[PDB]
Design an enzyme around this catalytic site. Structure first.
Site, PDB file in Angstrom:
ATOM      1  N   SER A  58      -1.489   5.563  -7.133  1.00 24.19           N
ATOM      2  CA  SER A  58      -2.423   6.612  -6.743  1.00 24.19           C
ATOM      3  C   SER A  58      -1.656   7.793  -6.148  1.00 24.19           C
ATOM      4  O   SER A  58      -1.753   8.064  -4.952  1.00 24.19           O
ATOM      5  CB  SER A  58      -3.450   6.084  -5.777  1.00 24.19           C
ATOM      6  OG  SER A  58      -2.852   5.751  -4.532  1.00 24.19           O
ATOM      7  N   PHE A  87       7.089  -7.736   2.558  1.00 25.45           N
ATOM      8  CA  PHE A  87       7.151  -6.382   3.102  1.00 25.45           C
ATOM      9  C   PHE A  87       8.380  -6.256   4.017  1.00 25.45           C
ATOM     10  O   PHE A  87       8.560  -7.049   4.919  1.00 25.45           O
ATOM     11  CB  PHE A  87       5.860  -6.058   3.862  1.00 25.45           C
ATOM     12  CG  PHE A  87       5.814  -4.680   4.468  1.00 25.45           C
ATOM     13  CD1 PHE A  87       6.387  -4.427   5.708  1.00 25.45           C
ATOM     14  CD2 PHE A  87       5.155  -3.644   3.829  1.00 25.45           C
ATOM     15  CE1 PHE A  87       6.338  -3.158   6.261  1.00 25.45           C
ATOM     16  CE2 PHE A  87       5.121  -2.377   4.388  1.00 25.45           C
ATOM     17  CZ  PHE A  87       5.708  -2.143   5.601  1.00 25.45           C
ATOM     18  N   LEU A 125       7.256   2.870   1.887  1.00 21.27           N
ATOM     19  CA  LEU A 125       7.225   1.413   2.062  1.00 21.27           C
ATOM     20  C   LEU A 125       8.329   0.776   1.211  1.00 21.27           C
ATOM     21  O   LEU A 125       8.429   1.047   0.022  1.00 21.27           O
ATOM     22  CB  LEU A 125       5.844   0.887   1.651  1.00 21.27           C
ATOM     23  CG  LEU A 125       4.655   1.668   2.188  1.00 21.27           C
ATOM     24  CD1 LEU A 125       3.352   1.108   1.645  1.00 21.27           C
ATOM     25  CD2 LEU A 125       4.644   1.665   3.699  1.00 21.27           C
ATOM     26  N   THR A 155       9.281  -2.880  -0.289  1.00 23.50           N
ATOM     27  CA  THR A 155       8.703  -4.194  -0.557  1.00 23.50           C
ATOM     28  C   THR A 155       9.558  -4.928  -1.577  1.00 23.50           C
ATOM     29  O   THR A 155      10.452  -4.332  -2.199  1.00 23.50           O
ATOM     30  CB  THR A 155       7.246  -4.077  -1.047  1.00 23.50           C
ATOM     31  OG1 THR A 155       7.252  -3.435  -2.321  1.00 23.50           O
ATOM     32  CG2 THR A 155       6.365  -3.309  -0.093  1.00 23.50           C
ATOM     33  N   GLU A 156       9.370  -6.250  -1.633  1.00 24.17           N
ATOM     34  CA  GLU A 156       9.796  -7.064  -2.762  1.00 24.17           C
ATOM     35  C   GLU A 156       9.510  -6.317  -4.073  1.00 24.17           C
ATOM     36  O   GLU A 156       8.406  -5.828  -4.282  1.00 24.17           O
ATOM     37  CB  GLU A 156       9.064  -8.419  -2.720  1.00 24.17           C
ATOM     38  CG  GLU A 156       9.435  -9.335  -3.818  1.00 24.17           C
ATOM     39  CD  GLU A 156       8.778 -10.718  -3.729  1.00 24.17           C
ATOM     40  OE1 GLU A 156       8.063 -10.990  -2.685  1.00 24.17           O
ATOM     41  OE2 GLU A 156       8.943 -11.507  -4.670  1.00 24.17           O
ATOM     42  N   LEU A 157      10.502  -6.332  -4.993  1.00 25.43           N
ATOM     43  CA  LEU A 157      10.352  -5.700  -6.305  1.00 25.43           C
ATOM     44  C   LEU A 157       9.598  -6.634  -7.229  1.00 25.43           C
ATOM     45  O   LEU A 157      10.081  -7.714  -7.555  1.00 25.43           O
ATOM     46  CB  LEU A 157      11.734  -5.367  -6.871  1.00 25.43           C
ATOM     47  CG  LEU A 157      11.731  -4.686  -8.244  1.00 25.43           C
ATOM     48  CD1 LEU A 157      11.452  -3.206  -8.111  1.00 25.43           C
ATOM     49  CD2 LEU A 157      13.048  -4.919  -8.974  1.00 25.43           C
ATOM     50  N   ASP A 164       0.436  -4.749  -2.057  1.00 26.35           N
ATOM     51  CA  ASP A 164      -0.115  -3.550  -1.442  1.00 26.35           C
ATOM     52  C   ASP A 164      -0.720  -3.906  -0.089  1.00 26.35           C
ATOM     53  O   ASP A 164      -1.761  -3.391   0.271  1.00 26.35           O
ATOM     54  CB  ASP A 164      -1.144  -2.885  -2.352  1.00 26.35           C
ATOM     55  CG  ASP A 164      -0.540  -2.255  -3.598  1.00 26.35           C
ATOM     56  OD1 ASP A 164       0.722  -2.263  -3.716  1.00 26.35           O
ATOM     57  OD2 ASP A 164      -1.316  -1.794  -4.453  1.00 26.35           O
ATOM     58  N   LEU A 165       0.056  -4.621   0.724  1.00 29.76           N
ATOM     59  CA  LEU A 165      -0.355  -4.954   2.086  1.00 29.76           C
ATOM     60  C   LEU A 165      -0.170  -3.733   2.987  1.00 29.76           C
ATOM     61  O   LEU A 165      -1.001  -3.462   3.846  1.00 29.76           O
ATOM     62  CB  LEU A 165       0.469  -6.137   2.584  1.00 29.76           C
ATOM     63  CG  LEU A 165      -0.174  -7.513   2.392  1.00 29.76           C
ATOM     64  CD1 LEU A 165       0.738  -8.614   2.908  1.00 29.76           C
ATOM     65  CD2 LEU A 165      -1.535  -7.581   3.078  1.00 29.76           C
ATOM     66  N   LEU A 171      -0.321  -0.562   1.917  1.00 29.60           N
ATOM     67  CA  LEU A 171      -1.347   0.382   1.507  1.00 29.60           C
ATOM     68  C   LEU A 171      -2.688  -0.021   2.134  1.00 29.60           C
ATOM     69  O   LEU A 171      -3.378   0.812   2.725  1.00 29.60           O
ATOM     70  CB  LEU A 171      -1.426   0.389  -0.028  1.00 29.60           C
ATOM     71  CG  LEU A 171      -2.245   1.522  -0.645  1.00 29.60           C
ATOM     72  CD1 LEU A 171      -2.151   1.495  -2.174  1.00 29.60           C
ATOM     73  CD2 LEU A 171      -3.685   1.450  -0.203  1.00 29.60           C
TER      74      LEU A 171
END
Length: 265
Positions: free
Chosen positions: A21, A73, A89, A91-93, A158-159, A161
């Site tokens: 988004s 995360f 952010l 994060t894990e890929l 998406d924690l 987000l």
């Protein structure tokens, strides 16, 4: 090669992994592990200090999550290129796409896959719900459930987000959420709609032409027409338990995990 953590932990590269988004994912590196990571930026965003602190506190809790069905995360922070503002952010890929991309590709799912993936989602949710304090996702959907590839398991993502959203087409959501009311049971409702979409390969309430129609139906306890298309009795039964109008009358996660469907395979 362009960005770097204030310490020096993670590096950013110029490779794009894709968009969500206006949220663009770069490829990154954790030098402390030599593990590739996802380097996420939300292009242009900002807000208030109480809200800022709220994000900061909740964000710090995310870093301590470790579960097989949750996207790891790492870190977050604000920055300003020139020019443009953004939140970052790390994060894990996840490279192997989402449930949403899976469904868009094949438009069908085997029962064995649906059972195994739906169990994994429930285990993820139960893990979040039984943190101290509880973490409610509140934005669960097919496009933030990620497939691993090794072992082809799923993780809730998406924690970061979701936290941003909680700190303050968009969509249908549980009936209570229209009144900005929620507990754990909003994640159960979203689970149910995820399972419906998996079982039919249709976006729910596709028959409706505007948000208002969807609002009327959802708050009435009128189910999406796609519910009628579900072919597996036990899947239909599970979905029905999850998307009940009154949050207090829905299945619990424990209820769901104990269902015979999941004792089958």
């Amino acid at each position: 090669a362009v960005g770097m953590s204030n310490d020096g932990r993670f590096l950013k590269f110029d490779i794009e992994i894709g968009r969500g988004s206006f949220k663009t994912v770069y490829k990154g590196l954790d030098t402390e592990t030599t593990v590739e990571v996802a380097w996420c930026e939300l292009q242009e965003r900002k807000l208030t200090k109480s809200e800022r602190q709220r994000f900061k506190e909740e964000a710090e809790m995310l870093k301590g999550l470790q579960h097989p069905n949750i996207v790891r995360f790492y870190d977050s922070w604000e920055s300003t290129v020139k020019g443009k503002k953004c939140i970052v952010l790390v994060t894990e890929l996840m490279t192997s796409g989402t449930l949403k991309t899976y469904l868009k590709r094949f438009k069908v799912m085997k029962i064995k896959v649906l059972r195994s993936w739906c169990r994994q989602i429930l285990k993820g949710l139960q893990f979040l719900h039984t943190r101290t304090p509880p973490i409610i996702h509140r934005d669960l959907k097919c496009d933030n459930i990620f497939i691993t590839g090794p072992t082809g398991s799923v993780k809730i993502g998406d924690l970061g987000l979701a936290t941003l959203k909680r700190a303050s087409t968009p969509e249908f959501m549980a009936p209570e959420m229209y009144e900005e009311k929620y507990d754990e049971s909003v994640d159960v409702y979203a689970f149910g709609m995820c399972m419906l979409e998996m079982a039919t390969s249709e976006y729910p309430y596709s028959e409706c032409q505007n948000a208002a129609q969807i609002y009327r139906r959802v708050t009435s306890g009128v189910k999406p027409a796609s519910f009628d298309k579900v072919a597996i009795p036990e899947v239909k039964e599970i979905i029905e338990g999850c998307i009940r109008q009154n949050k207090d009358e829905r299945y619990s996660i424990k209820d769901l995990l104990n269902h015979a469907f999941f004792q089958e395979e």
